[PDB]
Amino acid sequence: DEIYEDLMRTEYDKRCCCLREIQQTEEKYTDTLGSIQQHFLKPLQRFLKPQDIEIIFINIEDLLRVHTHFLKEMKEALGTPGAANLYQVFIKYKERFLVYGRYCSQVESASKHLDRVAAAREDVQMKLEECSQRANNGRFTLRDLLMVPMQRVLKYHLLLQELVKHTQEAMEKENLRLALDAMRDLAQCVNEVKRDNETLRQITNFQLSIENLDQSLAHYGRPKIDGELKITSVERRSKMDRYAFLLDKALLICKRRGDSYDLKDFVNLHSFQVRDDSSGDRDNKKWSHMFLLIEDQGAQGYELFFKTRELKKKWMEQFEMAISNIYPENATANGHDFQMFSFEETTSCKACQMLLRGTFYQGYRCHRCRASAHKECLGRVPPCGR
Ligand SMILES: Cc1ccc(-c2cnc3c(N[C@H](CO)Cc4cccnc4)nccn23)cc1
Ligand SMILES: [Zn+2]
Ligand SMILES: [Zn+2]
């Protein structure tokens, strides 16, 4: 991005040059956090209402407080001849940079609110231009500066990557790779928050469209796939034209009515299994591509028909992915009973002790002992009722 680019401006040169670059951009970034606080946050408190400040700036002050201490510890480690303790700074501050979670989640809606407050008031609109002049001579608006903290967290792993490449001492190279991994994890934490928020928006849209559904879709996990299909059942053997929404825990069978969809059948995937039918084959005919969805006690069996082989293939992989998410490998290992969970507060995995990243269905919780864990960590968790 152009705004970040403009704001941030021998074999062992490269190694030493990278250290200067890291320290320079960190000072430049901490001053930018200071600029938002002094030139925008304190003067706008006299204009905007307290709730508007809370929404637009979020925890910006706490970010500045964390980076003030980070730049101080960075300077001491880089200062000492050798800079061998630099890796320890990045490892310690990865856990301190958790404060970014709240920021990353709320920043898009803070930008939207800032636009609304400025559009409604020429008074605020003129004060926003005034602040930009006193801080950066109008080169950067508050709108662009509030997006800078997010651009910055995604740069740390690109900075340490270059430093690792140009480090020749095998022990310092190995220690810096631990700091590089920890920074690569921080960049993944951002993606999980953006990705989960987009899922939460998609769910909201589906609630609007689906009629006669008297339940929140958030209870069924993540949307998998949605689309037209033909359906058959044991008691009604003729193909019914339908629209289906597949989420991790449920399949909704609806009837399309322009934009609106009327719920006809609710299928709870905890009790159902997928069975392939290769009979409709070699893409012979439209609507001949079928698989079965059978209830685990033989109570019901649905035949699902799709227009093409490509479509049927895609739906089958998504049903497999959904049932694997309800019932993952080692879900009942060591006395536990791990089930899909959406965590409100910041939580760590009982097995690897790492964060359950994101804002929606981040992992699993055993209902018995209440231990939290990642999908791939279930078998490693301590036995239920230690
Ligand atoms: C740079 C960066 C660092 C960390 C994050 C980040 C990613 N996921 C979380 C998290 N998740 C919890 C569930 O454990 C729910 C939750 C989510 C968001 C806010 N508050 C609570 N807690 C703290 C931070 N988190 C994102 C970006
Ligand atoms: Zn884990
Ligand atoms: Zn348990």
Rg (CA), the chain: 27
Q: What distance in Å separates the CA atoms of residue 179 and residue 149, rounded to the nearest whole number?
A: 20
CB 180 within 8 A of CB 157: yes
Beta bridge partners of 139: none
Residue 138: in which H helix or E strand, if any?
A: none
What's the chain's length in residues? 386
Q: What distance in Å separates the CA atoms of residue 252 and residue 227, rounded to the nearest whole number?
A: 11
Pairing state between β 260-268 and 372-373: unpaired
Q: What distance in Å separates the CA atoms of residue 350 and residue 75, rounded to the nearest whole number?
A: 35
End-to-end CA distance of the chain: 51
Which of 192, 199, 357 has the most ligand 1 atoms within 8 A of CB, as the residue to mutate? 357
Q: What distance in Å separates the CA atoms of residue 375 and residue 250, rounded to the nearest whole number?
A: 19
Beta bridge partners of 251: 246, 267
Beta bridge partners of 226: 245
Of the candidates 182, 105, 118, 116, the residue with the CA atom closest to the CA atom of residue 149: 105
| Residue in the block written with tokens 């901490």 | 30
Cα 100 to averaged position of ligand 1 atoms, centre (Å): 7
Q: What distance in Å separates the CA atoms of residue 329 and residue 215, rounded to the nearest whole number?
A: 29
Beta bridge partners of 279: none
CB 192 within 8 A of CB 358: yes
Q: Phi and psi (nearest 5°) for 283?
A: 50, 40
User: How far is residue 139 CA from its own chain's centroid?
Assistant: 31
Chain gaps in the chain, named by the residue before each (C–N > 2.5 Å): 9
Measure the CA angle with vertex 121, ends 119 and 127; round to 5°: 105
Is any ligand 1 atom within 6 A of the Cβ of residue 347? yes
- Measured from the Cβ of residue 152, the count of other Cβ atoms closer than 10 Å reads 21
DSSP secondary structure code for residue 36 in this structure: I
- Measured from the Cβ of residue 290, the count of other Cβ atoms closer than 10 Å reads 18
Sheet with 250-257, strands from edge to edge, namely: 210-211, 260-268, 250-257, 240-247, 223-232, 301-306, 289-295, 272-276
Beta bridge partners of 245: 226, 252
Q: What distance in Å separates the CA atoms of residue 220 and residue 246, rounded to the nearest whole number?
A: 9
Cα 325 to averaged position of ligand 2 atoms, centre (Å): 16
Residues with Cβ–ion distance below 5 A, ligand 3: 336, 366, 368-369, 384
Q: Phi and psi (nearest 5°) for 27?
A: -65, -50
What CATH number did the domain enclosing 114 receive? 1.20.900.10
Which of 100, 109, 186, 365 has the most ligand 1 atoms within 8 A of CB, as the residue to mutate? 100
Sheet with 372-373, strands from edge to edge, namely: 338-341, 363-366, 372-373
Is any ligand 1 atom within 6 A of the Cβ of residue 197? no
Full residue range of the structural domain in which residue 16 is found: 2-207
Q: Which residues contact 336 (CB under 8 A, 6 or more apart)?
A: 366, 368, 369, 371, 378, 381, 383, 384
Pairing state between β 210-211 and 260-268: parallel
Cα dihedral sign, 52-53-59-60: positive
Q: Phi and psi (nearest 5°) for 41?
A: -60, -55
Q: Give the number of the ligand closest to the Cα of residue 362.
A: 1
- Measured from the Cβ of residue 134, the count of other Cβ atoms closer than 10 Å reads 13
Residue 99 Cα distances to 55, 58, 357, angstroms = 16, 11, 13
Q: Phi and psi (nearest 5°) for 332?
A: -115, 20
Is any ligand 1 atom within 6 A of the Cβ of residue 190? yes
Q: Which residues contact 193 (CB under 8 A, 6 or more apart)?
A: 101, 104, 105, 357, 358, 359
If DSSP states are collapsed to H, E and C, what string results for 279-347?
A: CCCCCCCCCCEEEEEEECCCCCEEEEEECCHHHHHHHHHHHHHHHHHHCCCCCCHHHCCEEEECCCCCC
Q: Where do the H-state alpha helices sit in the chain?
A: 2-7, 11-35, 42-44, 50-57, 60-79, 86-96, 100-120, 122-136, 142-145, 148-153, 156-165, 170-209, 309-326
Q: What distance in Å separates the CA atoms of residue 361 and residue 376, rounded to the nearest whole number?
A: 14
User: Whose Cα sits closest to atom 5 in ligand 1?
Assistant: 101
Which of 190, 355, 356 has the most ligand 1 atoms within 8 A of CB, as the residue to mutate? 355
Q: What distance in Å separates the CA atoms of residue 84 and residue 170, rounded to the nearest whole number?
A: 12
Is any ligand 1 atom within 6 A of the Cβ of residue 55? no
Is any ligand 1 atom within 6 A of the Cβ of residue 374? no
Is any ligand 1 atom within 6 A of the Cβ of residue 98? yes
- List, as one string, the DSSP characters of 233-248: -SS--SPEEEEEEEES
CB 377 within 8 A of CB 349: yes
Dihedral in degrees, nearest 10, Cα atoms 175, 186, 328, 361: 160
